[PDB]
């Protein structure tokens, strides 16, 4: 038994997922006056949720079908609301901000999770937090803010961070009190989010517009489909890595994956970055790694 693939599969899958997301959301469809921007975040998130739910169903039906799910449906619905809210808010924010900024902001999960835990759950962090978390804040203030009001994009990113913190709190509570497996939770929350997003797109009137837009630029279809696939397989790998190595291994793996994704976005796509902004990303990632190691 060899486990390099715990690194290789997750890294490749999520790296390609990030590249496809950048190519889709920030792509320059059309030209000149005919140029159009991808404003259909709901449809993208709905497709991703559908693909993830299908893969989760396959995984549970083929892997470890003996387990019985003790969780309550309403808990799954409540978690899925925040989960899909976070995903939609982040994807919509990506329309305004660059991709490096989007990923860096979405990486700062520890700050909202600590705030939620201390303010609501009352858990105290002697050394796990309050140290290497101020490092993350310093890095963000170095990158997002510079010496030389905030727009819609960072507001939406902050909202996504808050929703992600709420989702994490709910998931932790349900895991503790109902012993829910990763595959079952992933399937259920993805199904609930798929239903909610289907209702939202159908009633909002965005499905017709998205279909017309795709008809205008058919290639995007392929892209988004691949994107969805890369969001599933990699996720599955992470699940395995959760049960094979442990949580710390998964955390460090995703941290290095995010760093390499930022590097790829900066270099391949010619996203403009400058000195004293690289320092912010370095500080953020160092703080995230130290927090993962301790606590």
């Amino acid at each position: 038994l060899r486990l390099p693939l715990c690194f290789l599969g997750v890294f490749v899958c999520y790296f390609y997922y990030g590249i496809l997301q950048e190519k889709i959301t920030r792509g320059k469809y059309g030209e000149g006056a005919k140029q159009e921007t991808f404003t259909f975040a709901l449809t993208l998130v709905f497709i991703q949720c559908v693909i993830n739910a299908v893969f989760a169903k396959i995984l549970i039906q083929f892997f470890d079908t003996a387990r019985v799910d003790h969780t309550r449906s309403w808990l799954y619905a409540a978690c899925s609301i925040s989960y899909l809210g976070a995903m939609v808010s982040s994807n919509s924010a990506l329309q305004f901000v660059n991709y490096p900024t989007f990923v860096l902001g979405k990486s700062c999960k520890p700050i909202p999770v600590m705030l939620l835990g201390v303010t609501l759950l009352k858990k105290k962090y002697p050394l796990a937090k309050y140290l290497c978390v101020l490092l993350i804040v310093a890095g963000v203030a170095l990158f997002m803010y510079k010496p030389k009001t905030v727009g819609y994009g960072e507001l939406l990113l902050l909202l996504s961070l808050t929703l992600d913190g709420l989702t994490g709190v709910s998931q932790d509570h349900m895991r503790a009190h109902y012993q829910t497996g990763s595959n079952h939770m992933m399937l259920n929350i993805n199904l609930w989010s798929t239903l909610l997003l289907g209702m939202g797109i159908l009633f909002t009137g965005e499905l017709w517009e998205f279909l017309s837009f795709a008809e205008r630029y058919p290639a995007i279809i392929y892209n988004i489909l691949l994107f969805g696939l890369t969001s599933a397989l990699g996720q599955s790998f992470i699940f395995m890595t959760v049960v094979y190595f442990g949580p710390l291994t998964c955390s460090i793996i995703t941290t290095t994956r995010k760093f390499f994704t930022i590097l790829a976005s900066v270099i391949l796509f010619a996203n403009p970055i400058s000195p004293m902004q690289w320092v912010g990303t370095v500080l953020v990632f160092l703080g995230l790694g130290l927090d993962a190691k301790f606590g």
Partner: single-chain antibody, 235 residues
């Protein structure tokens, strides 16, 4: 399956003393920081009474005297102001793995000596070996199609409990892997009953069979119990 061992077989204690009963599991019974342990109390000739879940959380209605502590593979139940009422056999149960297992039981004895759910079990008393048996548990005051687990458990002579199986209101059922090939659990919603059928009963099946209602929270907790029906297998 996890084997639960209760350290004190029988504790001779006086009134007012602080009594601690220790239970140990063959494997860690923690899951994301939650200890899946339950403590029940059984008075003589009565069904077990649910006391504690999660190893520290006192069930509503239980006196404040009782408390729980411990983690990992070692747990303890403490009663500081012991009274006459808390004289019984105490059982520790693990809900980490599907074949839920109870402790051997610790007996405590003193020196010098429509608004609720009703479960009723019925079935033959004396049965020849190799015959097929069918116990029926009828529920009144509640519907088996609402959110609760309905379990069949049996207690052998010597007070050794053994969870046989259960059926959820969704229709999903779980069985003890040891007995999975000998028992079958079914339900009839029209009459609001559920049945356990045993094939090829043997002399070792003699026991008191209870049907219980349980809810899952930090482990399965058999909060409501039936009166128990005796079954004797003899030639």
């Amino acid at each position: 399956d996890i084997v639960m061992t209760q350290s004190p077989a029988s504790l001779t204690v006086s009134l007012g003393q602080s009594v601690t009963i220790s239970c140990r599991a063959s494997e860690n019974v923690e899951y994301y920081g939650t200890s899946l342990m339950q403590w029940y109390q059984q008075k003589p000739g009565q069904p077990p009474k649910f006391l504690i879940y999660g190893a520290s959380n006192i069930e509503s209605g239980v006196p404040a005297r009782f408390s729980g502590s411990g983690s990992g593979t070692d747990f303890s139940l403490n009663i500081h102001p012991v009274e006459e009422d808390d004289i019984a056999m105490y059982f520790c149960q693990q809900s980490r793995k599907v074949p839920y297992t109870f402790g051997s039981g610790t007996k405590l004895e003193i020196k010098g000596s429509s608004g609720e759910v009703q479960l009723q079990e019925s079935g033959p008393g004396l049965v020849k070996p190799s015959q097929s048996l069918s116990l029926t548990c009828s529920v009144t005051g509640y519907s088996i199609t609402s959110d609760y687990y309905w379990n069949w458990i049996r207690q052998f002579p010597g007070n050794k409990l053994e969870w046989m199986a259960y059926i959820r209101y969704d229709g999903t059922s779980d069985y003890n892997p040891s007995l999975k090939n000998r028992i079958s659990i079914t339900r009839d919603t029209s009459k609001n009953q559920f049945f356990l059928k045993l094939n090829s009963v043997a002399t070792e099946d003699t026991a008191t069979y209870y049907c219980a209602r349980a809810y899952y929270y930090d482990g399965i907790n058999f909060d409501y119990w039936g009166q128990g029906t005796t079954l004797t297998v003899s030639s």
